[PDB]
């Protein structure tokens, strides 16, 4: 039950360094082998922290975590699937809402949860 | 050698989809066994009951030869238990108006070993819904 | 604890009596003064059972309720909120899905649960 | 007259709203509220923070002139502490170009009394979002 | 309260006869002399009943028919209007079940003890069973 | 034949009023139980007049024509009339524009004025 | 008064003539000299019957014309223009009722004892039986 | 021979008050009791001056009247229907032509020929357009 | 009079078209006939063999001939010009109108008319057309 | 010879039109010239009025006269029939070609060859077009 | 002179060749070595008889050849360029009228004249077309 | 100059293979490893002849030309061809169609014999 | 072997004198009875210099022309037909890299001393600077 | 395996040089006989480097490459094949970032010892700069 709570927070944090354009912080969560799929990158399993990096180094948003599944698989690895509905306004100052399905797979090394995978179908955020 | 049995199991458990044998298919998927595809529009879907439907539905009437190819299969280990795999699955079928046709998917699934046997406990779908009631 | 499984049984009756076209169960289920906003009644509140009755005096499907949640208030009141998932085969043979979100309010009238409002907002089943 | 009190309370909750007071909505609001409405794309919301950032970012700026009329209100009296209203929205508006606009929702609110106050615990809204920020 | 639900009742026949393709029924409800504003006149006011006869005439599916907020405003004991929505469940010619809305405002004249439509106004759907 | 006339020249007053944005005027012809079918209010009927103060309170060349208005006398006290109501204007764009209206008033006399108790609009919302 | 009601019952017989197929009724009502203004003259003015004939001789479904808001001008003793509103209720090939419009003006001229139509502008809707 | 000839000037010459927007000539040769079917009336019979009167309250224009035929109904009583061409340059510069088909019915009044009744089909002509 | 007979000359080339008497058309066309027609894509076109086609290859049609102008040019040379309204039922069985402007060169030769060029602008108007 | 004689007043027919030279143009064309074109809307329009009203309210352009046809008809009448592709740059500063079909009826009238009849179909190419 | 007619006759078999489906007369008259550009090529040049012969191997219809230019160049070598005016049925048994322009280049080898290159633009117009 | 027509002509064979639905004839052509970009692997890299397979399995009159063939010798043992490839057919309709590929072949001879180790196609899929 | 790069040099010579805007060295090139088939002239014939003339003196960005695949016929000592696909690369107003594709024959008949461009067939894009 | 990192480093020093508008780097890992075929060719076998110059002689904002799933193909100590998926994410006009894909074919032949591009298909996005 406390081990669930260790991969929500940790994910929110993830979520959070996203917002923040803060990369340093993303890189210190993510594996540096980190596999993704997601809208951006067109059907393509990329690798790196490099195609993540772009979007970082190149207003006010609110994300909001629902029905969070954590599968605990053993001491070291978790699984958790969420949806992320996120408001934020856009350019031309009108308030929207986006939805995106997230898996996220975890490894826990040298005593840090550290993100391996990452699943993202819908919005791109 | 653990990787070439992830890629084996994901391998029968296509093979079981592609059949309409869910028998063989509940016997590889944990029955906790979470979901994200395209036919559940956005939700998380929790039993096999959500496919159960897509297996009880499909007749003879409903067959047609489907080649299935999966692509760059990385797989991530995590200690002796735990393990992920990330592939593209390509499927070669033929249309009702008897045209060749190819669908893509991005498939996520993440397995659990318990008492030997590797249990499918997740699983994220992207693109083209396969299934071959689909 | 118990209160709330009671309020997600009858739901489930109400919706197998609808996927059932047993207009004699559904009616055991609804108060006779049942309110309803629903797509099929362009943006008006209706009264009846005469509105419900056209659908079933005139194929496999599958229901699933997610994320049931259940508001008790008092003895004899409660508010349900679920999404409900429908898959059906079409005319043509093909299997679809479709999504819609409903509040049911029940009253507790002579020991049986009644549903007094219904809101059903997305696909029309 | 319970059945006055139920829509006077709506009446104020929508107020609030129209004002840009997430002060006066908290109080008529059960922190626990479950809500159903188009800016939640099909899903069950359940705190005030998915309320609170249509308050946040609503400046004299974003202000324009706005009158709420609740028509056909229909409200369920289900004892002594429990009522449900269901009512329609028309909002009339001037937009950004300086042009009169109608919108139109259906809302189920549902009330629970605690201490003599009625409080709003479930909220369904389709059709047009109505908040002053959409 | 009891002049309302006269009005009310008599709106409801009206609708019926409509429906059942009564023209006998429809003729005894409406003044001879009946304006009416509808769809199917293209926004042109016609004169009573030769208009609606070919409704009817032509008349050879389900349809169940709603009025919602009916509001009769009474005017002394000779005279009332009422202002309400139909709402039209049918079934179309490819078998899907359908919903269409009209406003409908009708003005009533009591003459020798019975209430006469003297006026009709329809906004929205034509919800005639011929469409 | 002289009743008839009573209604239309209330009717033309009231119109006059919309036009001139002048809510006193009007505020004085329509009953304050006022109902309104008009297609600003997307198919549902509206009562009284806070509906109709808006477009007031938020308030170019406008010639508005009344054709062949139908009068019908129910006693003394109570008129209906129905009339095609053709507008003038030019737009923003500095072009001249028709656009029509289909009306039915229902009128009820009340301490010796007549009042305007339902409002029946469809076509072109021309206020 | 009366001469008013005399131009409004032959335009009736007119179009009772079109509706009815009978080019040997419409032919005693038209002056051989009529000219036209209508739809499927493609904005020219046609002379003649020759034009009009072409319709009744290819006529091999009901229809119900309403005549709105008649303006008779009288000019002396053997000359009339009248303007109206021309409805035209039918029945499509499909089976679906529909309504046309059209926008009538007709020139008379009383002539061998008969009223005669010399003068026909038609805008709107061709609404000929043959279509 | 000579009355139709009346009928064709009184034509043009009301064609051109309208062009040059002079209501006060366009008056003189209308009854007041005008009738009017013509496109920016919806498809409406209109009665007044006060609907014309719009046109003129609020370019280089051409007019060519085509094919005018003329029924001279008794010493009173006659029918004009002409083509009206009108060449004009359009907003954005560029020439453009639009064509009408007319209808006029004419009634002489103390030695005045006055316009009863106007047909107007296709396009709008007035100047304010 | 001679305006008559070229009149008369050109509704019997008509006549012959609408019959498809490819015989009764060759009569009155000169054998170096020039025409420019929708059906030539802007291209002029020389002789009989490309009129042969629609003839060899061929429902109620009327024609009417509108504001007929004639140039008479000397004793030997004539020019018409008219507006050609075809009235045809189509293949639905619908009743349609088709509208040509027709410029038609005529030579009078060994005592006949002979049209020597035809010009044609819009609808093309030949039966199995 | 006679058939150099209608080139060449056709090509100065055309040159007039392309510099806006009304006087010129009015020297070629008698008084009574009727006109097929575009702008006119499937009408036949008569005299100089119609055709004034382009040159009133008037780029580089190169007119080409291609398969240039002429029937000569006795010693005072001839027709020709060409091709008239216009070079031209659009407002945009585009370079552009358009098509027009042309037959112009000519007749000698004191020792002048005078175009009577003029028929264009395709694109109308006068300058302000 | 003389050559020239040699040229649009030799050009008119082969025409007349491919509307016939005889690819033996084809074959005689083109080069083993015939380049062609063709609408159904997709803009690439093609070098066989291969090409061809599949539209052979696999309705009424009237073909008029405009304005042939003969290029002559030497005794062996010549260029023709036409207008090819194509007239059919199509399926729905209605006429049709398609253009193309066409270029042939000819060279003389033992007493025949031979096609050795061929450039279409427009219309396919071979009967499988 | 003659290792440049060996490429040519197996290349025709190996068209000629998929033409007749002859896989026996295709898989001694093609390497077991053969990497493929065509339009109908929706832009990934296939391996192997299964996804090939599909398409003889599974199955009018046609004509293939290979237009301006350049062949790239890269020593004894590797070529490269690349040609454009325009097919007449008949479709279903019986009306005639031109379609257009580029291709990419890449050669290795292994005892003796030319095998295709790689095939890119852009434009129609043309099997 | 040397007669077909004669017509090659001869025809990238004519190509650049276009892309220069040198009608100068164009005429020089060109028979003065230059017929021609193009887009701009809309399916037509066009003899002479006069209608290219207009391309060159209305001439006031970056082009490069690739010739693919010529194809030359020699058909005796003063006659050769050259066949080619010529790819034009440009930068269109917007700034953008574009490329057109159009496939030309050009006929060559050797007459005072230098060869002679005698006809002219151009299908796909214009590709002359004007555009 | 020594000899596929090779390729693999090479393709990645060529998509760098193009990147940076680098045609001197470019020219040197390109054979001069460079044969292509790419979007911006229309369909068409282009040969080598004057088609290419163009694109780097008119350039005058961000962009990653990503090389996915490089299969290298060894032939002989000389010949190599490689194929590969690029992905290409750059800020459009707007502002906004996108991604487009090509699926690239790069022969490559070993001369003096140094690896030379011989031939290259692309198919999908054209991805140079210049775009």
Redo the contacts between chains.
């Keep these: 039950h406390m081990r669930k709570q260790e991969i929500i927070k940790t994910t929110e944090q993830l979520i959070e360094a996203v917002n923040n354009g803060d990369f340093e912080a993303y890189a210190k969560i993510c594996d540096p082998?980190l596999?993704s799929?997601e809208p951006?990158?067109?059907?393509?399993?990329?690798?790196?922290m490099?195609?993540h990096?772009?979007?970082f180094?190149?207003k006010?948003i609110?994300t909001?975590i629902?029905?969070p599944?954590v599968?605990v698989?053993?001491?070291?690895?978790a699984?958790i699937?969420?949806?992320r509905?996120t408001?934020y306004?856009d350019g031309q100052?009108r308030?929207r809402?986006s939805?995106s399905?997230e898996?996220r797979?975890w490894?826990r090394r040298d005593g840090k949860w550290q993100n391996?995978?990452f699943?993202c179908?819908?919005a791109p955020v």
Tied chains: 1, 3.
Aim: charged share 15%.
């Design positions: 082998g596999t799929f951006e990158a067109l059907g393509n399993l990329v690798e790196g490099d195609f990096r772009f979007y180094e190149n006010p609110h909001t629902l029905n599944h599968h698989i053993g001491e070291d690895a699984c699937a969420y949806i509905l408001q306004i100052g308030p809402t939805q399905e898996t797979v490894h391996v995978h699943h179908s819908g």
